Amino acid sequence: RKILIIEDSELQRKLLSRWVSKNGYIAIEAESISVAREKIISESIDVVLLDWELPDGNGIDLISDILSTSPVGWLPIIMVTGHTEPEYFKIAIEAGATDYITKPAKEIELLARIFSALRIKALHDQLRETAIRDVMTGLYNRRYMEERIEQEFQRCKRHDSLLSMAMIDIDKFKNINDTYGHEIGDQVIKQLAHELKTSFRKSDIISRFGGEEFVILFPETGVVDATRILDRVRENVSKLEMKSDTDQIFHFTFSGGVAGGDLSDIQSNQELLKIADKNLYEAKSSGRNQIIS
Amino acid sequence: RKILIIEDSELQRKLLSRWVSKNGYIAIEAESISVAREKIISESIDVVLLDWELPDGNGIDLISDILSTSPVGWLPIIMVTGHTEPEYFKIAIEAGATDYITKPAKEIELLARIFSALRIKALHDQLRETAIRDVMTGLYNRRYMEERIEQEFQRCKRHDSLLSMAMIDIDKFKNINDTYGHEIGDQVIKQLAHELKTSFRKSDIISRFGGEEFVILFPETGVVDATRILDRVRENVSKLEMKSDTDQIFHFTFSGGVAGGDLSDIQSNQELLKIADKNLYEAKSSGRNQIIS
Ligand SMILES: Nc1nc2c(ncn2[C@@H]2O[C@@H]3COP(=O)(O)O[C@H]4[C@@H](O)[C@H](n5cnc6c(=O)[nH]c(N)nc65)O[C@@H]4COP(=O)(O)O[C@H]3[C@H]2O)c(=O)[nH]1
Ligand SMILES: Nc1nc2c(ncn2[C@@H]2O[C@@H]3COP(=O)(O)O[C@H]4[C@@H](O)[C@H](n5cnc6c(=O)[nH]c(N)nc65)O[C@@H]4COP(=O)(O)O[C@H]3[C@H]2O)c(=O)[nH]1
Ligand SMILES: Nc1nc2c(ncn2[C@@H]2O[C@@H]3COP(=O)(O)O[C@H]4[C@@H](O)[C@H](n5cnc6c(=O)[nH]c(N)nc65)O[C@@H]4COP(=O)(O)O[C@H]3[C@H]2O)c(=O)[nH]1
Ligand SMILES: Nc1nc2c(ncn2[C@@H]2O[C@@H]3COP(=O)(O)O[C@H]4[C@@H](O)[C@H](n5cnc6c(=O)[nH]c(N)nc65)O[C@@H]4COP(=O)(O)O[C@H]3[C@H]2O)c(=O)[nH]1
Ligand SMILES: [Mg+2]
Ligand SMILES: [Mg+2]
């Protein structure tokens, strides 16, 4: 629906700007990269037109500077460039552009690339607004568990059952990743998920919930038993010997809030979440490797 | 990893064929469109290069002739054309091409489009290799529901709960489809799913299970109650006025087996299925529009 144009030159920028808004689209102008970021966060930006040559960085650090800025952490970025060279295309795609236009842009080759992007965007939008299984961990994703909670809660609240929910978080993940590699970052998330899978009952509802976030539902289980068993894992994880990108041993831990059990005084399913969260906050806020309830 | 090239001319085709397999890829040659289809079905084809000008059709019927042929019903198709004209791009994208390449093809602008496609393919592949709801109906899919049943069963068997499972089937679907169109076929499946969604509890686990198959789980529900409510729907569906091909009113019905309730005598979760099926058999075998248990 909504396109953001980055171009240092006012005339080149306002030409694109018209081609866009002529075809029922919403033009959004950016002087250079400062302004562009204040829009990406500020508004619901579908597609990005990026002059390779901006008043700060040359294209190929400039690309991933918009990727990082995005809410979902990916926008479709069309290169509007005067670069021509074969290997400038293959650099731009390599660096995570969605498309490449060689200036001068023709109106009806552009509109076709904007369509081609809006297509490949709705794909990213599904994968992140629906119940998929996360390939990496083998656990379901988060909008799964959002749905699954409200089911499992409504069931347990109608049929006077115990329902206890955990909310887990890997301790200083940003750091593990930044220090050992996006590779080892991933390698840990896996090894944690593996412990979670092995530790409980097929009846229990494990799920990845965010970057390093996880969520467990323990139907028919009370807050203390939930804590007891979750804590027992937290320990075994603590004691787990991982290898660094040097083949150095290192350990990692998670913080946990658990919440629910009874449910008489919990009305919303969204309240049962608020609690698990407040409790994960304290868990971290108090030196991390520990469960709170 | 595996690219299929359609070009009438042997020399143009085997030039592309080398550019491809030079970059660690798998070239697959097609004389014209007959041969190409015998490959799409025959093998795991990632990406398609399509000469616009082939010995039978002009590009724009030729495109959707490959779309239909695909197992998943969509491949990324890159247009190799000598057409230049603005509105030939805008036709090709409109008609469901993934990209447009202007002959003569340059090695290193091609390889960039093939990469751009393999990316937008792996996105389609995620959404369909992990992704638990059926698109069409918005219900849980089958691979999920097989897993979900064994969970919900193991839960109910551990915690002495009632668990009743339905298995539904639209009556003489083949006929509805053959008479009114693959269009109206689809349109009914939807309308049934919608009734199923509206009729029960958030707690209940509805799922599309095959062409015209559906499955419901009624946790905490006994075989009779399951039957009563499932039968109440079967009725309202019966009374539903659908519109044909022609805007003719027509009605449709479903057959149902329900099974479980107690679970003391049922060991496998796969047995709880066998029963629902045997009962759907009788339901149909005895003049269809009816539940059996
Ligand atoms: N969601 C969930 N809750 C868990 C899990 N492990 C323990 N709990 C909770 O903790 C309680 C006590 O566990 P326990 O003392 O070993 O008490 C258990 C234990 O001795 C045994 N038990 C139950 N299920 C199993 C099982 O699958 N394997 C084994 N080896 N023993 C089991 O029977 C006792 C019955 O206690 P319960 O009524 O199950 O009550 C359980 C349950 O409320 C788990 O993996 N998932
Ligand atoms: N300490 C403790 N551990 C628990 C408890 N619940 C589950 N676990 C652990 O989690 C594993 C998975 O149990 P499950 O998936 O419910 O599936 C279980 C369950 O369906 C059945 N089973 C085993 N022991 C019991 C039991 O005491 N009661 C019941 N009702 N089923 C059991 O056998 C399966 C595998 O048994 P395990 O090899 O023992 O494997 C169990 C056990 O190692 C619990 O309450 N306490
Ligand atoms: N999974 C599932 N099971 C179902 C459903 N409808 C009925 N049952 C089962 O069959 C019984 C029939 O409920 P009812 O005769 O409609 O009589 C119901 C009805 O008058 C009322 N009631 C129950 N659930 C609801 C509800 O969700 N909404 C409203 N408005 N009333 C409800 O309270 C009575 C108590 O019924 P129960 O003790 O629950 O016992 C229910 C339960 O055993 C359903 O849609 N899904
Ligand atoms: N006769 C009958 N109809 C059923 C039954 N189960 C589901 N339905 C129908 O489908 C809806 C199911 O609501 P829910 O998801 O169970 O979730 C329930 C629950 O959260 C609450 N609710 C409504 N009635 C009851 C009830 O009797 N007991 C409890 N515990 N909650 C109820 O409101 C929701 C549905 O409110 P409704 O407007 O009535 O909407 C109900 C109702 O018209 C059933 O057993 N019997
Ligand atoms: Mg400029
Ligand atoms: Mg030719």
Automatic annotation (TrEMBL), chains A, B:
EC number: 2.7.7.65
CDD domains (alphabetical): GGDEF (cd01949), REC (cd00156)
Gene Ontology annotations for the cellular component aspect, listed alphabetically: plasma membrane
Gene3D superfamilies referenced in this protein's UniProt entry, alphabetically: 3.30.70.270, 3.40.50.2300
Binding site for Mg(2+) 4: 169, 212-213
GO biological processes: cell adhesion involved in single-species biofilm formation; negative regulation of bacterial-type flagellum-dependent cell motility; phosphorelay signal transduction system
Ligand binding (Mg(2+) 2): 7-8, 51, 53
Record's keyword annotation contains Metal-binding: yes
InterPro entries listed in its UniProt record: CheY-like_superfamily, Diguanylate_Cyclase, GGDEF_dom, Nucleotide_cyclase, Rev_trsase/Diguanyl_cyclase, Sig_transdc_resp-reg_receiver
Positions bound to Mg(2+) 3: 169-170, 212
Catalysed reactions listed for this entry: 2 GTP = 3',3'-c-di-GMP + 2 diphosphate
Enzyme class: transferase
Keywords: Metal-binding, Nucleotide-binding, Phosphoprotein, Plasmid
Binding locations of Mg(2+) 1: 7-8, 51
Residue stretches making up the GGDEF domain: 161-293
NCBIfam families in the record: DiguCycDgcRLepto, GGDEF
The protein's name in its UniProt record: diguanylate cyclase
Organism of provenance: Leptospira biflexa serovar Patoc (strain Patoc 1 / ATCC 23582 / Paris)
